[PDB]
Amino acid sequence: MVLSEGEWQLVLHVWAKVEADVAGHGQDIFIRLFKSHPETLEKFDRFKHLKTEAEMKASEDLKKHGVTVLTALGAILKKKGHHEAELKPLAQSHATKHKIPIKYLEFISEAIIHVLHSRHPGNFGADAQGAMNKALELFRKDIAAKYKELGYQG
Ligand code: HEM
């Protein structure tokens, strides 16, 4: 799949808002993920003891993790589809060290979309949401392809 320039512009316009508070958006997204799909929490040795939303909000390590994750994702989005080199180390650690199934990348995609919809309604109407969905689908398809090359394709 291929996004048009106009679709990329919608994606990077709302992402520019996210980047005004990377740490805050990172927290909301991981809390949404962990609350909606608790099984995902089990993949994180560092966080799986966290029992409540309050504990998650107070965790300094989870906040730092969320910043690392959104920073990596933002670098990929700003490539506008030319992201082969960025995806390679990411695919390798998630396939063979962390062991993250493609299904869980769909779950975090839904969490990102929910949080942008809640925080940026004026910059995230239906066309912008359609464009971000397409960007994230592109990301997932290209990581699934690398997963297969690396021997996991989980
Ligand atoms: C937008 C999707 C994602 C991005 C951009 C992303 C990015 C990252 C980055 C950059 C790191 C640190 C370096 C590394 O180990 O490669 C990381 C670590 C990790 N990722 Fe993700 N990731 C994503 C989705 C997920 C999902 C959905 C899960 C699990 C449900 C996951 C589980 C992990 C784990 C277990 C670590 C190690 C954390 C630690 O103990 O320090 N990732 N991820």
Q: Which atom of ligand 1 is nearest to the CA of 105?
A: 27
Query: Does ligand 1 come within 6 angstroms of the Cβ of 40?
Result: yes
Q: 3-state DSSP call for residue 151?
A: coil
From residue 146, alpha-carbon distances to 28, 109, 143, 152 in Å are 28, 18, 5, 9
Q: Which atom of ligand 1 is nearest to the CA of 107?
A: 27
Angle at 96 between CA 35 and CA 29, to 5 degrees: 25
Query: Does ligand 1 come within 6 angstroms of the Cβ of 35?
Result: no
* Gap between the Cα atoms of 47 and 139, Å rounded: 25
Contact 7, 134 (CB under 8 A): yes
Q: Which atom of ligand 1 is nearest to the CA of 70?
A: 5
List the structure tokens of 37: 């799909």
Binding-site residues from annotation for heme b: 94
For 37, list phi and psi in degrees, rounded to 5.
-140, 75
Query: Does ligand 1 come within 6 angstroms of the Cβ of 104?
Result: yes
Contact 27, 69 (CB under 8 A): no
Domain residues of the chain, as ranges?
1-154
Query: Is it true that domain 1-154 has CATH number 3.40.190.10?
Result: no
Query: Does ligand 1 come within 6 angstroms of the Cβ of 22?
Result: no
Entry resolution in angstroms? 1.9
